[PDB]
């Protein structure tokens, strides 16, 4: 009932426990649109409801937090989601974004190119991805687990996400990956979150909350995407823009979460408990350095 | 002694009847903020809209050098408050107007240092 006054709807746990088979996604309100406040872009609204939803989780929020945002360019050459993330994150939060095509951003640093050209040696406290190739929307061919940028994203998490860090990765019915679902079980908690403003879309954000570096539970990613579609197909979500009008509690609470540098041996059950509760980040606190690989070629003959 | 003057070009295009730059990124906010011109988080008051700063910067948006000799952008990574009556052309507004160094309001759209 009251879902319309939420920022959105998370996949209920009972649907996560099922063992459904993959069906085509058929949403009754497909095509319908939410009524946005005057002059507000869909992507600002969408990122705002996502951040409102994240305010209800146990995100680690250290001093000198580090956030990286993939797929942040739009078809208009600006970065609306990045602007929302920066409004949300505490002032001074290091924010890096990237996209395949050139765009103008409020991020502290921006890297243009395929995400695989992106390297950093630093770990990150929060990874956000809106990468999406709309060609993977073909309803005339089987809906298989997809690779491409999702393969980079799986590796970036295992390699570059600090312990206790969190992620939100955009998926759709056809833009999805089985290993990323599997990786969700390497966090203390996970969900698929549908924003109320885009509830007519099969989009969701796969949210992993407080990364533990290891499987906590075993997830078959093929089965779970089927469970997600099953949830969507049987639980129509009413399009709502209601949460966008109340911004008074929007800023991410600066928790001063502690940062420690530890080895794989020093990760005991006490540590893991604190990770799981959003009270600990494990990574170095060195300087942040990023780079973009550049292919060099001379076409003159 | 040649450099392109982008500010004049935009001003002249607007006077020729040109359509203002679009897709400035309007933020959701409380509209109970301080009203100051350029801030680290949206600070729109009741008669203002807040925008992502980069998207309202002529130099950012045109892929050209900033007038600063260091090239630093005063808008990128911040939020600019535009009077609601001028929000159809935020880039125009930021170009033409100047922020009070003292109180932090737009001269002529908030600043009252010059009173009493
Ligand atoms: C006119 C409006 C835009 C839609 C309106 N509801 C409708 O008329 N439809 C006609 C139906 O017979 C075919 C069906 C089931 O495919 C449509 N549909 C439902 N959910 C969908 C789709 C879809 O087409 N695609 C590509 C998706 O991704 N999703 C998630 C709905
Ligand atoms: C749904 S949009 C992103 C809109 C953006 N976040 C905003 O706030 O408006 C899709 C984006 O994902 C990017 N993308 C798709 N595949 C990519 C890849 N392999 N590497 C980097 N970016 C990719 C596209 O360039 C494209 O702009
Ligand atoms: Cl332009
Ligand atoms: Zn600029
Ligand atoms: Zn003044």
From Swiss-Prot, chain B:
Zn(2+) 7 binds at residues 57, 60, 66, 73. It is found in: Host cytoplasm, Host perinuclear region; Host cytoplasm; Host endoplasmic reticulum. Residues 1-116 form the ExoN/MTase coactivator domain. Zn(2+) 8 binds at residues 100, 103, 111, 113. Coiled coil: none annotated. Plays a pivotal role in viral transcription by stimulating both nsp14 3'-5' exoribonuclease and nsp16 2'-O-methyltransferase activities. Therefore plays an essential role in viral mRNAs cap methylation. Forms a dodecamer and interacts with nsp14 and nsp16; these interactions enhance nsp14 and nsp16 enzymatic activities. This is Non-structural protein 10. It comes from Severe acute respiratory syndrome coronavirus 2 (2019-nCoV).
């Amino acid at each position: 009932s009251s879902q319309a006054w939420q920022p959105g709807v998370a996949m209920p746990n009972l649907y996560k426990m099922q063992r459904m088979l993959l069906e085509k996604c058929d949403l009754q309100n497909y095509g319908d649109s939410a009524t946005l406040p005057k002059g507000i872009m869909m992507n600002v609204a969408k990122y705002t409801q996502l951040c409102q939803y994240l305010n209800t989780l146990t995100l680690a929020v250290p001093y000198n937090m580090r956030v990286i945002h993939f797929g942040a360019g739009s078809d208009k050459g600006v970065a609306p989601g990045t602007a929302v993330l920066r409004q949300w994150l505490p002032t001074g939060t290091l924010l890096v974004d990237s996209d395949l095509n050139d765009f103008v951003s409020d991020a502290d640093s921006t890297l243009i190119g395929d995400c695989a050209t992106v390297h950093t040696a630093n770990k990150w406290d929060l990874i956000i991805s809106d990468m999406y190739d709309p060609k993977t929307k073909n309803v005339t061919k089987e809906n298989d687990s997809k690779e491409g940028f999702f393969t980079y994203i799986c590796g970036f998490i295992q390699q570059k996400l600090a312990l206790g860090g969190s992620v939100a990765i955009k998926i759709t019915e056809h833009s999805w990956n089985a290993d990323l679902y599997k990786l969700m079980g390497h966090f203390a908690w996970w969900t698929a979150f549908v924003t109320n403003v885009n509830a007519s879309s099969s989009e969701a954000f796969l949210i992993g909350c407080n990364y533990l570096g290891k499987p906590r539970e075993q997830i078959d990613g093929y089965v779970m995407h089927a469970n997600y579609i099953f949830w969507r197909n049987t639980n129509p979500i009413q399009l709502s823009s209601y949460s966008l009008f109340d911004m008074s509690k929007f800023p991410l609470k600066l928790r001063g979460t502690a940062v420690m540098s530890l080895k794989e041996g020093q990760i005991n059950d006490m540590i893991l408990s604190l990770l799981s509760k959003g009270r600990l980040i494990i990574r170095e606190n060195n300087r942040v350095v990023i780079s973009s690989d550049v292919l060099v070629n001379n076409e003159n003959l | 002694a040649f450099a392109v003057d982008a500010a004049k070009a935009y001003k002249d295009y607007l006077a020729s009847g040109g359509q203002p730059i679009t897709n400035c990124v309007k933020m959701l906010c409380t509209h109970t903020g301080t009203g100051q011109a350029i801030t680290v988080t949206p600070e729109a008051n009741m008669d203002q809209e807040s925008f992502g700063g980069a998207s309202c910067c002529l130099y950012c948006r045109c892929h050209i050098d900033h007038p600063n000799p260091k090239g630093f952008c005063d808008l990128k990574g911040k939020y600019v408050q535009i009077p609601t009556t001028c929000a159809n052309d935020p880039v125009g507004f930021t170009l033409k107007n100047t922020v009070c160094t003292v109180c932090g309001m737009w001269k002529g759209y908030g600043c009252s240092c010059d009173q009493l």
